DNA sequence: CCTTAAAAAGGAGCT
DNA sequence: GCTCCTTTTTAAGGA
């Protein structure tokens, strides 16, 4: 009955916001929580501590940009096999077992420019470590369907190539496919008064089966919205 | 590429 | 390491 919660926190270099995120995570009580864009540099890795979530695996560059992290609840059990940390801090893959069941989580943050090509280059750069139990989530910085933009301007070529490279490895957009005809968005761009869903949850089709519920959470922490996923 | 808004990060000047 | 203000950063439409 585990729950996974993805969020683009947009910077964590102030201790006050760190305690705010602490309280928010305690209130949400996720089995696993995926943070993107911590803007934490590796020197500062040790500053991300949240009581009740002792196990934290981040990936940080040497500049206050990007920075991903995966937090595991003390209430749950997590036995990791192998962990791959991006040298630049844009993705981290944690592979192992959650409640005895196998699971490989890819927490990804793509740059805004050339986002779909970056996502697929990582996706096929790692596929030997990819498998049938995969869960790739995070800050895609790109739409996937035409409904992921309020403008509804139908989707770029690189993005549909990505939605089909998902296909050639049998990965599918858990949210788009447990929720098509969606008008829920994760990011609001003020300079344009537009809305988009650039944050995503994308898993193996094997695990369709297990996926029970998805949800989208407004918060006071970031200009992005969090995505919750119930697993049983 | 260039511009935007608005928040995150940085920096001056004192504590 | 502050307060208060300046600069950088980040998503995204328009040329």
Numbering used by the authors: 7 to 238
From the primary publication:
The autonomous non-LTR retrotransposon long interspersed nuclear element-1 (LINE-1 or L1) is one the most abundant mobile elements in the human genome, comprising 17–20% of its content. ORF1p acts as a nucleic acid chaperone that binds L1 RNA, while ORF2p provides endonuclease (EN), reverse transcriptase (RT) and RNA-binding activities through three distinct functional domains. L1-EN initiates de novo L1 integration by producing a single-strand nick at a genomic site generally fitting the consensus target sequence 5′-TTTTT/AA-3′ (6,7,24,25). L1-EN belongs to the family of metal-dependent phosphohydrolases that includes apurinic/apyrimidinic endonuclease 1 (APE1) and DNase I, which are part of the exonuclease-endonuclease-phosphatase (EEP) domain superfamily.
Two mutations were introduced into L1-EN to facilitate crystallization of the enzyme complexed with DNA: D145A to prevent DNA cleavage and Y226K to alter crystal packing. The double mutant protein L1-EN-D145A/Y226K was readily crystallized in complex with two DNA substrates, dna14 and dna17, and structures were solved to a resolution of 2.8 Å. There is one DNA-protein complex in an asymmetric unit in crystals of L1-EN-D145A/Y226K with dna14 and two complexes in an asymmetric unit in crystals of the protein with dna17. Crystal packing is completely different in the case of the L1-EN/dna14 complex, where the terminal single nucleotide overhangs form Watson–Crick base pairs with symmetry-related dna14 molecules, thereby stabilizing the B-form helical conformation. In the complex of dna14 with L1-EN, we observed extended electron density around the A+1 phosphate at the scissile bond. Instead, we modeled two alternative conformations for this phosphate group with one corresponding to the typical conformation expected for a B-form helix (as observed in both complexes with dna17) and another where coordinated rotation of torsion bonds moves the phosphate closer to the active site residues, while largely preserving the positions of both 3′ and 5′ deoxyriboses. Importantly, this rotation brings the scissile bond phosphate group closer to active site amino acids Glu43 and Asp145. Thus, the observed rotation brings the scissile phosphate into a position favorable for nucleophilic attack and the proposed transition state (see details below). In the alternative conformation of dna14 bound to L1-EN, the rotated-out phosphate group is even closer to Glu43. Our structural analysis of the L1-EN-dna14 complex revealed rotation of the scissile bond phosphate group leading to two distinct states for the nucleophilic attack and a subsequent transition state.
